[PDB]
Amino acid sequence: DLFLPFFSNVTWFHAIHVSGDNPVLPFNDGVYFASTEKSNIIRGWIFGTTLDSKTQSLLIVNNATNVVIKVCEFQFCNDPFLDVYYHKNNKSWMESEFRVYSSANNCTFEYVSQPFLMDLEGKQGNFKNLREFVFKNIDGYFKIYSKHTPINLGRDLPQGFSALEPLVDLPIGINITRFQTLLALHRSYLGWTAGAAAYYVGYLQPRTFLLKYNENGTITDAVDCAL
Amino acid sequence: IANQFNSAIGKIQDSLSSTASALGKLQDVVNHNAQALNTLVKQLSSKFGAISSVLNDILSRLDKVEAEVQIDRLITGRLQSLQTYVTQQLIRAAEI
Amino acid sequence: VTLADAGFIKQYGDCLGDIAARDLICAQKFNGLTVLPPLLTDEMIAQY
Amino acid sequence: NKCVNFNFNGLTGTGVLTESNKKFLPFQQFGRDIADTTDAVRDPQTLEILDITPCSFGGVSVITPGTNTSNQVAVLYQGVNCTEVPVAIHADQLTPTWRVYSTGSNVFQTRAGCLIGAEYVNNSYECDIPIGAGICASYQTQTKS
Amino acid sequence: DPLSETKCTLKSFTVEKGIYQTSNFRVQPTESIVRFPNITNLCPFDEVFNATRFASVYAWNRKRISNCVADYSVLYNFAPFFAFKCYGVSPTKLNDLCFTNVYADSFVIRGNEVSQIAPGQTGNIADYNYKLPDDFTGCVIAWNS
Amino acid sequence: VSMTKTSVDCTMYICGDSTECSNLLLQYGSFCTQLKRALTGIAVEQDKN
Ligand SMILES: *[C@@H]1O[C@H](CO)[C@@H](O[C@@H]2O[C@H](CO)[C@@H](O[C@H]3O[C@H](CO)[C@@H](O)[C@H](O)[C@@H]3O)[C@H](O)[C@H]2NC(C)=O)[C@H](O)[C@H]1NC(C)=O
Ligand SMILES: *[C@@H]1O[C@H](CO)[C@@H](O[C@@H]2O[C@H](CO)[C@@H](O[C@H]3O[C@H](CO)[C@@H](O)[C@H](O)[C@@H]3O)[C@H](O)[C@H]2NC(C)=O)[C@H](O)[C@H]1NC(C)=O
Ligand SMILES: *[C@@H]1O[C@H](CO)[C@@H](O[C@@H]2O[C@H](CO)[C@@H](O[C@H]3O[C@H](CO)[C@@H](O)[C@H](O)[C@@H]3O)[C@H](O)[C@H]2NC(C)=O)[C@H](O)[C@H]1NC(C)=O
Ligand SMILES: *[C@@H]1O[C@H](CO)[C@@H](O[C@@H]2O[C@H](CO)[C@@H](O)[C@H](O)[C@H]2NC(C)=O)[C@H](O)[C@H]1NC(C)=O
Ligand SMILES: *[C@@H]1O[C@H](CO)[C@@H](O[C@@H]2O[C@H](CO)[C@@H](O)[C@H](O)[C@H]2NC(C)=O)[C@H](O)[C@H]1NC(C)=O
Ligand SMILES: *[C@@H]1O[C@H](CO)[C@@H](O)[C@H](O)[C@H]1NC(C)=O
Ligand SMILES: *[C@@H]1O[C@H](CO)[C@@H](O)[C@H](O)[C@H]1NC(C)=O
Ligand SMILES: *[C@@H]1O[C@H](CO)[C@@H](O)[C@H](O)[C@H]1NC(C)=O
Ligand SMILES: *[C@@H]1O[C@H](CO)[C@@H](O)[C@H](O)[C@H]1NC(C)=O
Ligand SMILES: *[C@@H]1O[C@H](CO)[C@@H](O)[C@H](O)[C@H]1NC(C)=O
């Protein structure tokens, strides 16, 4: 199938808004994406061929509960990101404006779904947690797999094992060639407010693996047959 | 002569108690007869050019004229898998 | 020397449930492949 | 626990269904073996996992003297526990139509299988017809008394 | 009887002394069991075929069918249909059978170009508008409109 | 001195108790009996050895 090769060279990105540069990523075969960021600063994604409304494109946006996915001729901004702030007229926290695109033209497919991949059960005192995703685009179908695991502070992407379960599937019926990710900047009105967002990207390849299912029927080990 | 013999039988017990693979000539017969049956049961998963290897899928999804050209591929390949196993076992049986 | 089957009775209670997930002999048996017992038992060979 | 034809979501087949010990992940509908055939399924009305096992079966061997010597025979159900031959009674349909052996009265468990129509005797003889696992069978007059 | 089964297994009217392996016994299915999900509404696909106007083939329209009873016969009795061409299934089996994801691709075609909807064809529709796989599972239905 | 005796139900290996598969298998004639005979020949020899 189509996997992240063992011991392969992943890019590690740091992004920061810095209060008072980020060029679009390629998307070839598929992407492993992972992050360990506290306070939900990383949300969602764009995937597409052109990202400027000349051809159709994919948008995924998470928030505090449920996700929206929409496939459209979006005119994206060179920096797409999400703002959530306290609106005094509502005495509560929400988005102001959809500053991810300048325009959404005639969209073809619209979708909404369950939240997925929360933080830990009741949270904890900075003992860490890794979230892992695989995004794959084959025969016009876009497949999403993911996991999360608690991790002790040796280092993120630790040695050990855990496989990604399938979580979402959708026939977007479009070419994908590039992609981006949505940050949630806090923007506290008294204006702006800085925060960092660390994330890992590793493209997959057409590959043969040998998978060790334990008696519980979970993939507890694997061999990458071309390593 | 008795003490030499009694100690030489003592070394047989020690050798058989310590070493892993001295009976390899017998364990290899078990391992080859087990490997051959595991191989023969593996060839049930093979499609041989049919739409499925699972005979019940074909009979859940096709009717009694185009199902048959799937079933016949599986008959042809599985019958070849037995003819291979039985030839290998007739050859092994001559060595034993 | 550790055997993979010896051809003695499996009471079908042996075959269903958990054991088919962990012993290949069941997959073999459920596909019509049968190990037969030898005519002389291991006690009967030890006598000779 | 009974032999049935089944169909789960179009997956036709034949077997006995049983309470499984298997922890399917929520996205899984079918569980599968080394021969690439379905051995477990999640019932689509009540979400529980069922083991599928094929309905009981075995080889048969017929033990005979010469046809010129007698027409009576004994039958070995090879690899069968004799307590399962009370299930092999033709009360439901079976592949061998000749139910008469199932009358028993002289049923004997060998480790080769369930042997029917031959009486077991304690006094040993040379092996005439080999049943297996140290057992042999013969046609002769048994009148110790 | 089991002697007669050996005579046919050996193709001889006389069987000499021995033990003869004959036809394997099987317990047969006692009854037939069906388990589909207990969803009840008839599929909304009738609303696509009866639409005021279909999609243009350069922008062919794809609809999900989900969570419904696909009784195709009452749909085939709503309108005369000129074709039915099922590729991975026989039309007779469609009642006994369940589906994971069902997508209707819907558009309008000149009768000549319907020849190119078959798997692996080439021509302006298949080359640039609408390419189904050369191994797709499904059925193509068409009618003069 | 010997190896494991094996017997095979040719019919059940090839056809998983499908009757229409069994009716197609008869088109191939005696090959299943030849396999059964050959394996019976091997199996009877293990006791002889
Ligand atoms: C996360 O973001 C989601 C949108 O990206 C958001 O979904 C939106 O939720 C509101 C409130 O339920 C819906 O508003 C509509 O509600 C009814 C519909 O009949 C009307 O009275 C309203 O006037 C309005 O039309 C939006 O339609 C819905 N958007 C979508 C695309 O479904 C989630 O609610 C957000 N989650 C949280 C926790 O805030
Ligand atoms: C496959 O899943 C099984 C079910 O989750 C799991 O069995 C569970 O294993 C744990 C750890 O051994 C047991 O926890 C108990 O262990 C002993 C008592 O046996 C106590 O010292 C502990 O404090 C604790 O109570 C679970 O009881 C046990 N559950 C069951 C139903 O057996 C298997 O271990 C999993 N497989 C693998 C490879 O780990
Ligand atoms: C022929 O070969 C014999 C060995 O297979 C050898 O026997 C061995 O002789 C030595 C003494 O020469 C013995 O050694 C022990 O002797 C006493 C205790 O009895 C102690 O003082 C020593 O420390 C030592 O323990 C061996 O035990 C003995 N081995 C056996 C099996 O009896 C013969 O001596 C050889 N004969 C000739 C003519 O060469
Ligand atoms: C979405 O974008 C534009 C504007 O709605 C659409 O372009 C028009 O399409 C109609 C129908 O073919 C033509 O009559 C107009 O002349 C087009 N306008 C221009 C400026 O070219 C486009 O077709 C829409 N696409 C979809 C899929 O709805
Ligand atoms: C044949 O199968 C039966 C079960 O159907 C076996 O009977 C069990 O034997 C064990 C050991 O003696 C007992 O603990 C159980 O209580 C018995 N169960 C029943 C329902 O009687 C029998 O032992 C098997 N015989 C052989 C030769 O394997
Ligand atoms: C990963 O690849 C880059 C070049 O694209 C290289 O600079 C870097 O050192 C590589 N790291 C490893 C561990 O191979
Ligand atoms: C069958 O449908 C009814 C009505 O929707 C539902 O209450 C019931 O739970 C379903 N049956 C099962 C076994 O779930
Ligand atoms: C059958 O047995 C009789 C004696 O009972 C003997 O005369 C005859 O030759 C035998 N025939 C065969 C074919 O074995
Ligand atoms: C064999 O002998 C024992 C007594 O030693 C007896 O209990 C048993 O009933 C005998 N076997 C048969 C088949 O009668
Ligand atoms: C098609 O749908 C309309 C409602 O939009 C309905 O009146 C009409 O009867 C339907 N066609 C047929 C042939 O029933």
Side-chain angles (χ1 to χ4, degrees), chain A residues 216-227:
Chain A
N216 303 41
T218 66
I219 297 164
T220 193
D221 205 348
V223 175
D224 177 7
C225 304
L227 173 65

Side-chain angles (χ1 to χ4, degrees), chain B residues 16-79:
Chain B
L16 293 177
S17 302
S18 68
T19 201
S21 62
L23 267 72
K25 292 192 60 58
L26 304 185
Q27 190 65 57
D28 289 348
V29 176
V30 178
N31 289 8
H32 288 172
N33 282 270
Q35 179 173 33
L37 286 175
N38 292 339
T39 298
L40 180 64
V41 93
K42 225 88 67 164
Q43 283 291 71
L44 295 172
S45 304
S46 299
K47 292 178 181 175
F48 304 113
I51 62 168
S52 177
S53 54
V54 186
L55 211 71
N56 303 305
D57 296 353
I58 290 157
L59 299 173
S60 302
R61 328 187 331 179
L62 305 187
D63 97 61
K64 226 73 68 182
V65 66
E66 80 291 347
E68 301 198 327
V69 293
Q70 311 304 324
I71 301 294
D72 189 52
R73 299 180 181 179
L74 298 178
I75 289 165
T76 298
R78 289 178 181 167
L79 185 64

